[PDB]
Amino acid sequence: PINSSQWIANGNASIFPDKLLLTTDDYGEAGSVWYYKPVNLSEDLVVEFYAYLGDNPDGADGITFTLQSLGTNELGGTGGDLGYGGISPSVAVEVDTWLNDFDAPATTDHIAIDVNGNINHTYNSLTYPTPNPYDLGNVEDGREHLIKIVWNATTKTLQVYFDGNLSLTWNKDITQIIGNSAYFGFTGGTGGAKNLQYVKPIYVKNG
Ligand SMILES: [Ca+2]
Ligand SMILES: [Mn+2]
């Protein structure tokens, strides 16, 4: 059900017939998988996918959905960088499964909006600004979670749903950050703690 010709894998990521593997259950990884064709952010974008964050609550580090206007070879840092940190220009929705000192004010596994490769929630809230991270409780439960991301190119808003629940919204024009065209894809990282991490894209609608 995945067409491997449409996806470009970097680092420790791999393309499988039914999933995009971001990290294996091993230390120090970074992986990214980009879709081969950019999207037009002067039109609406809806992305729905299942996310698997692992079966170890004491594991790490998490995944992103990322929009970025560089191209299909990009790979961000390992560990708490989630395979994303350092990528710019970009907007990411992270599902973060390890609390770093820079993760305040998160207190559990959390979902957050990051900008231009910055994974520090207080810096982003002071600079852009981005919303506070939203605590999910433990999502390293060995289950697939449904994530939906909605960009509205008329209101200039982003919504994020997790297991059917509205979790984050934002009113920044992301096209003023990354431009009107972007590649989309997924990243993950592991560090001194680890988890098997993957996504299963379900639906992408642009306009
Ligand atoms: Ca983290
Ligand atoms: Mn975080």
Side-chain angles (χ1 to χ4, degrees), residues 61 80 82 96-100 102-103 110:
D61 274 275
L82 311 185
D96 182 346
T97 60
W98 173 276
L99 285 174
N100 300 89
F102 54 71
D103 277 317
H110 54 277

